[PDB]
Each structure stands twice: as C-alpha cells, then as structure tokens.
C-alpha cells in the first residue's frame, strides 16, 4: 500500500523528465510517436548519422537535413510539405 503508492509518484516524476514512458494503457498512437521522436533525435544527433542521411537524400547542406529531422517531430510537417 505505502510502497505501491510511492510507485505512482515516481512514475509521474520520471515521465516528466524523460517524456516517453508508457504506463499500461498507452495508445498505439501514443507509443508510436515516442518511437518516432527518438529516432529523429538520434539521426540528427550523431554527426555520422547526419552525414549518412544528408548524402543519401542529396540535400544541399547538412544543416537542412537537420531541420528536416526536427520539423518532422511535428505532426503537421507532413501536411506542410504537401501544400507546397
């Protein structure tokens, strides 16, 4: 009882720090987003993996791939490209 209700309290504190921590009832929609935002963060973050993506895209400057990856963290970046 006293322990189990500590457990709740840390769940809400870890979720604030480290963002995506599922609990139990987590929408597939909800979980997927967190998998998408860590991949985008890692692809941009390591300077190897930013090159490798930049060259493969044929994007003009490494910097533009980096913003392509961060705007993708938004849901309305798919729509925004389509309206161009």
């Amino acid at each position: 009882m006293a322990e189990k209700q500590r457990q709740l309290k840390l769940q809400k504190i870890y979720k604030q720090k480290y963002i995506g921590l599922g609990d139990e009832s987590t929408t597939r929609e909800q979980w997927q987003r967190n998998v998408r935002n860590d991949t985008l963060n890692t692809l941009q973050g390591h300077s190897a993996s930013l090159e490798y993506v930049s060259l493969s895209r044929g994007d003009l400057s490494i910097r533009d791939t980096r913003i392509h990856l961060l705007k993708s963290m938004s849901p309305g970046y798919k729509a925004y490209l389509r309206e161009e």
Partner: protein
C-alpha cells in the same frame, strides 16, 4: 440495520484496536483500514474517528495513532466533502504550533495531503470565515495552516486569497493575519520565495501603512524573513519599501524601532556596495543609541544588525576596532548575558562574525577577560567564542604572550567545568591543531593535569581527563614526547579495569589514539600483554565499551597481527560472533570488519567454520551479519578460499542456511567488484537451483546476486551465462510481494547491461501490448526501467516496420 449495524461495530472495534491495543493487534487493524477504507462510509469513519481527538484525556502515543489513521484514509478516498474538511482542520491545524518538531511535521503532513484531496476551491472557502475570526489562537493557527496549503498547491493559486485578506479594509485582523500568511509562506518556501516575491509585495507594502501598530510591526518582520530567505537576489523589489522604513525609524522608537531595524538590517547584505555602506553608517548611529535598552526585543535586533554589517565592504576593520568593538565586548559580555541561552547563541555568533573583519588577534585579545572570570557559566560562553573562532580564525596571528595566556585560560576553564559538554574538548582541540609545533613548551604541564585528573573521584572528571588525551596525541607525535606517550599509555592501561562504562570507553579511545601513532615495537605493556586483557572486556555488555574495544582489537589485527597466538584470535572470533546480537548498528558494523582483520591474520578456514555454524541460528540479525562477514572474509583472503566452502554449505537441507549462503554471495560479489568474472560459471548452477526453487525468498536473494554480478561483470564476455540467468528470471515478472518484485526488477535492470538492450528487449516487446492488462501492466514496468537507462540506445531496436506503423521514418531505409 442489523446487518449494517455490524460495520458500525467493526470500525469502532478497529478504531479501538488501533488506539488501545496490542502492537500485534493494531498492526493488523491498520492493514484492514487501508484496504477497506473505501467500502466504509467516509461519513462513518470521520464522524466516529474525529471526536476522539477532541477529548482532553488522550496521551501523545494514542493521538498519533489516530492521526496516522486520518493520514492513511485521506490518502485513498481522494474525493472529500466540505463539512469534514472543516472538522479535519480543527483537529490537524493545532499540531502546527505544537512543542516538538516531530508532531509539527505529522500535522503538516496531513494538510498537504488534504490540500490535494479536497482541492483548491474548497479549503479557501473554509479559511475565509476563519481568518476574519475574532479569536487570537484560531488566527495564529490558520496563518500556519493556510501557508502549508500554499506550498502544496503553489502560492499563485492562493495569492488572490491573501491579497483579499491583507488589503481588506473590512476587518483589522484580516489585514494582520493575512500578513502572517506571508511569513510562513516565506519560511516554508525558503529560498524559493523569490519568483513569487513581486506578487507578495502587493500585500506587504500597502498593508504596512496601517494606523494599527500591531500591523505596522508584523510587516516589518515579514520583510526581514522575505529579505533573508531571498538573500542576494531580491533588492530590486525591496526599494519600494525602503523609504517608509526610515521615516518610521527616525521617529517611532519603542518596539516599532526594533522591528524596522530588523527589516533594514536584513536588506543591507542584498544592497549594492554603494548603498550598503550608506545605510549601515546610518543604522550604526541607531544601535549605539540603543545599547542601553533593557528590552529583549531590541537586543535581539541590535545583535542582528551588528551581525549583518561586518560583511559590507564599506566599513573598514579599522573603524570597528577603533569604535564598535570596545563598546561591544563591554556591554554584551556581561555575566547576565551568559545565563540565558537564547541570547548567548546570538552574542557568540555575533562575536564570531566580527572576528573576520576584526583581526583574529583582536577578538581573542578581548576574550581573555571572560576566560579568566570567576563565574563558571561565563567562562564556558567565552570558550565557545574562541573554539568557534578558532576554526574560524588560524592561530598564526597570536604573539607569544596570548598563546600562553590563551592556554592558561582554557586549562582553567577546562578544570572547573561541571556539566559534560563537547565544547571544551573541540575548542581546546581546535587550538592545538592550529599551533601544534608551537605547543611543545605548554605540553608538559598539561599532561601533568591529565595524570592528576585520572586519579580523581568524581567519574566525570575521569572522562574529561581521558577525553582530552585523545585530542592531544596527534599534537604530541609532532612534539616527540614519546616517553610521555609511553607514560600516558601505561597509566591508561592500569586504569583499564575501571567500573564506569562511560569512563572506561574513553580510556580505550585514548589507548587507540596512542597505538596508531606510535611505533608498534615501542608500546610499553606491551601489545602482547594488552590484547589478552581486552578479550574479557568484549563481554562487558553496555555499548561505549563494546564499540571502543572492537575498534581497538581491530586496530591490532591491522598493525600487529603476529603478537597474540592464533588460538587467542579464535577466542575473539567467538566473543564477537556472540556480540553482534547487539541492538546498536555501529557495533554490528565494526564486529564484521574485524573478521576481515582476523581472517587476514590467522586464516580464512578456521574462521569460516565458526561463521557457517552460526547460520543455523534463527534470529535474523545473526544470519545477516554472518552473511556479511563471509563476504568480508572472501574479499580479504580471496574468494577462491571461501567459495567452495560456501557452495558446499548450500547443500544442507535447512532453508535458513540456504538463504544465508545466497545472501553471503550477494555481499561478496559487491565487495570484490571487478573480480567476480573468474567466479561466474561456478555459480550459475548454484543460482540455477535458487531461481527454480519453490519458496519465494530464494528467488529474491539469487536475483539480488544477479544485480551485483551483472553490473560489474558486464562487458567481460560471459554473456551466455547471463542469458541462462535471464531465461530463469523472466517468468518471475508476474510475481507479487513487494520485496520480491523490486529485487527481481533490479536483476532485470542489471541483466540489461550484461546482455544489451537489444538482446534483452526481445523478451519484452511481446507482452508490452498484450490483451491481459496484467501481463501488460508488468511488462511496462520493465520497459520503463529500460527506457530510462536507454533512450537513445533503444532506437535501433524497436520492432517497427513501414506497414506496422503509419508514419515510420522514411530515412531509415535510405542507403548510400
């Protein structure tokens, strides 16, 4: 009725067992409430429970058992109506003023729980009729209660409430108490007041101007608390209030002068160097004028300002010595000061702060008149100022004359002390450490008085005679008076059959200080004649003797193992193994450390058989404290010596041995940190039987071996023994019990580092969704522990394909 009249008894029976009941009774009736609190009507609980707390009969033991039930009930239900929120605060809030802090906190623990339960809107409705109340005590209570609410919910939500009360022209008293709410907001929030300081300042300034003096005074204190709690940062918000203070200082005198100066005194350190020099030299005029004020309220304010000013750059240390200092020591060091404690703490602290600006040699110069004074309680005050100063000051400043006069003052003030206190020893010991090589000439007569006081009848004086040897030893070795060292040592040896345990403990302590410093060969008794005199002392019960002895015996195990013959070390290993029944901890901890010192000396195998024969014993401390010692014997003498003897002992069919052999293996794998790799492969079959076994405690202790064994053997390349060890754990994921399941999660978190997140997550993706809400609930704990350790390390491994999710990321399929 007759059915539901039964619940009406059960609660009244439970509430009876809790309040008055056997310790094994109430412990079962608390378990029943915390589970069943929901099904019983909160009306029935509170209406029955709360009236008890209003009788005049209940004892403090009985009251805190009732409050602990309110706190455990409020934690669950979570939706509570207003009639009881008024009742609960009638009971809970008067705790906040109670004498001792243990009660003060458990009262505060309620209101911060109630604040979330009952929500923001409800409580603030219950305070409004209460703050306008006429009664004083009720207002003093809910200043402290509404402030506790403020921290829990955040002050901004509660701020317009205060602003309504403080700025209220309706009632005078709402202004007053609305301002006290600002203190206990500023006191609770501590430094964090700050960002809220602007909103709070709405209340203080305008509420300051009130024609009622008792309001005028309160704000002057609520500023000094906001000023201090803020510290360096605030000033920009306190300029608005700085003007009306002075016109209040330059006139009102009385007790309004005591409060305004406290405010202005505590704004100074947060002023700029430009102003801070100005206002103090302004204020230092006022203090000089108020030195003669017999009031207490003013003296507490005069000390605050003297205390604050020295820090400010503008005043020079010359100005102090020329004026402020001589008019200080003569007025504030009167013997009437030393008597009352609340104003002693201030004067010494004020003296100590002035000692920075003042040359150290200046303050110590002025403290010689009180150190030589006739009154006892006044010599003790002037010692605290030197000792406190002494750590604070370096003794390099003192000319030779004060260095001689200081030590004569202390010896005297040492040898008339009545009450037992640490202050004289630390003080007389912070002086010696500073000037140590210079101490040589003064060290002859001091040691004569130690030898004179060890013959004295009153047992306190034989404590302080021996307590002051333990301090001088590190001084003496620098001095080189080794013969004295051997003179003190023998004299401490012949006294070592004393009666009083308080005194006998401290003699051993001085024996321990002489022994470590001195040449091992030299000691007079010598060592081989000393140690057999200690072994019968280990059986002395008490504690001061057990602790100080165990540290002395273990010292010899380090420094001179070869003296007592090994059958004597075995006589000690039994006397210690009986001694860790003790209730103290530091005993049990030092007793285990000295098995390492003996195992190094004589041998591990003679000692282990003594320990493993002791795991059969029932009582838990004995089995855990043997399990530690086997861990310690392993580290010191090597695990290869210990481990096959422990793996054999595991076969015995008694269960308590089989945990004690698994617990011993936990300890020994954290003490040999990195080693551990050589030994795996041997223990995988021993942890094979444990995680397979039926009873839930083996599956707990072996998984507590895996946590130690995985962390520090990771990256070694075992890794096929950790998949084995994993294959056995994961089926324990569904296990309940609290001690079992956290030990298993720790194992799974640690095995993540042996395997890696990818190879480990293969077990966990599957049931992370799952239909079962329970299987699902258990895997998500494990996943959450993994996600914290690895966020970017999981990203390659997610089980995600372009069709399996909508968006995916198209840049993961790009190939250059």
């Amino acid at each position: 009725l007759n059915k539901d009249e039964k619940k009406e008894r059960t609660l009244s029976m439970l509430l009876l067992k809790i309040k008055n009941g056997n310790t094994a009774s109430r412990r079962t009736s608390m378990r029943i409430l915390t589970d069943k609190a929901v099904t019983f009507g909160p009306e029935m609980i509170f209406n029955r429970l709360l009236p008890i707390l209003l009788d005049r009969s209940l004892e403090d033991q009985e009251r805190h058992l009732m409050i602990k039930t309110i706190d455990r009930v409020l934690y669950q239900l979570g939706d509570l109506t207003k009639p009881y929120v008024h009742k609960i605060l009638v009971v809970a809030a008067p705790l906040l003023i109670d004498e001792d802090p243990m009660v003060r906190s458990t009262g505060q623990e309620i209101i911060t729980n109630l604040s979330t339960v009952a929500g923001l809107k409800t409580i603030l409705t219950v305070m409004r009729p209460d703050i306008e109340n006429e009664d004083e005590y009720v207002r003093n209570v809910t200043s402290r209660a509404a402030a506790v609410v403020a921290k829990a919910l955040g002050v901004n939500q509660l701020l317009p409430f205060i602003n309504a009360a403080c700025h209220s022209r309706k009632s005078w008293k709402a202004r007053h108490t609305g301002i006290k709410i600002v203190q206990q907001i500023g006191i609770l929030l501590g430094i964090g007041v700050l960002n809220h300081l602007t909103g709070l300042m709405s209340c203080i300034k305008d509420c300051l101007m009130d024609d009622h003096v008792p309001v005028r005074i309160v704000t002057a204190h609520t500023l000094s608390t906001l000023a201090e709690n803020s510290y360096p940062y605030g000033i920009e918000v306190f300029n608005v209030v700085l003007e009306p203070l002075w016109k209040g200082i330059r006139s009102h005198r009385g007790k309004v002068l005591s409060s305004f100066l406290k405010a202005v005194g505590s704004m100074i350190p947060l002023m700029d160097p430009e102003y801070a020099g100005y206002y103090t030299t302004e204020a230092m005029r006022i203090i000089r004028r108020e030195f003669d004020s017999p009031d207490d309220e003013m003296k507490k304010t005069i000390l605050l300002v003297l205390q604050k000013c020295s820090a400010v750059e503008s005043i020079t240390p010359k100005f102090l010595r020329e004026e402020i200092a001589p008019e200080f020591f003569q007025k504030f060091w009167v013997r009437r000061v030393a008597l009352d404690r609340p104003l002693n703490k201030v004067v010494t602290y004020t003296t100590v702060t002035l000692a920075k600006k003042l040359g150290c040699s200046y303050t110590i110069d002025k403290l010689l008149t009180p150190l030589r004074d006739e009154a006892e309680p006044f010599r003790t005050m002037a010692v605290h100022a030197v000792t406190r100063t002494v750590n604070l000051l370096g003794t390099a400043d003192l000319d030779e004359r004060l260095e001689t006069r200081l030590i004569d003052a202390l010896l005297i003030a040492f040898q008339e002390q009545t009450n037992s206190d640490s202050i004289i020893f630390k003080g007389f010991g912070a002086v010696t450490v500073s000037l140590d090589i210079r101490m040589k000439p003064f060290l002859a007569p001091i040691v004569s008085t130690i030898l004179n006081h060890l013959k004295h009848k009153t047992p306190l004086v034989r404590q302080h005679a021996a307590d002051l040897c333990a301090i001088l030893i590190p001084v003496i070795k620098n001095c080189h008076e080794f013969e004295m060292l051997n003179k003190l040592n023998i004299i401490l040896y012949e006294s070592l059959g004393e009666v009083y345990p308080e005194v006998l403990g401290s003699i051993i302590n001085a024996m321990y200080c002489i022994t470590s410093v001195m040449d091992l060969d030299k000691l007079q008794p010598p060592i081989n004649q000393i140690l057999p005199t200690l072994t019968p002392i280990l059986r002395n019960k008490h504690r001061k003797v057990e602790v100080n002895t165990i540290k002395f015996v273990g010292l010899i195990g380090k420094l001179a193992p070869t003296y007592a013959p090994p059958k004597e070390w075995m006589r000690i290993c039994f006397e210690l193994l009986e001694l860790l029944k003790s209730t103290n901890k530091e005993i049990r901890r030092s007793a285990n450390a000295t098995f390492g010192f003996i195992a190094e000396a004589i041998g591990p195998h003679d000692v282990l058989v003594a320990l493993l024969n002791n795991l059969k014993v029932q009582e838990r401390q004995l089995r855990v404290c043997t399990a530690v010692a086997i861990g310690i014997v392993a580290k010191v003498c090597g695990p290869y010596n210990v481990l096959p003897v422990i793996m054999n002992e595991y076969t015995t069919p008694e269960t308590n041995v089989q945990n004690g052999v698994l617990k011993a293996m936990s300890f020994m794998f954290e003490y040999i940190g990195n080693m551990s790799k050589d030994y795996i492969y041997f223990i995988t079959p021993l942890l094979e039987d444990a995680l397979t076994d039926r009873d839930l405690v083996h599956r707990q202790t072996a998984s507590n071996v895996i946590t130690h064994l995985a962390l520090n053997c990771s990256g070694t390349g075992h890794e096929d023994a950790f998949i084995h060890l994993m294959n056995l754990l994961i089926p324990n994921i569904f296990e309940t019990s609290p001690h079992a399941i956290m030990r298993i999660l720790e194992g799974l978190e640690a095995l993540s580092q042996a395997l890696g997140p990818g190879l480990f997550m293969n077990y966990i993706w599957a049931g992370l969704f799952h239909p079962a809400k329970n299987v699902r609930k258990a895997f998500w704990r494990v996943y959450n522990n993994m996600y914290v350790m690895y966020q970017d390390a999981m990203v390659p491994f997610y089980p995600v394909t372009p069709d399996n999710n909508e968006e995916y990321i198209e840049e993961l399929d790009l190939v250059l």
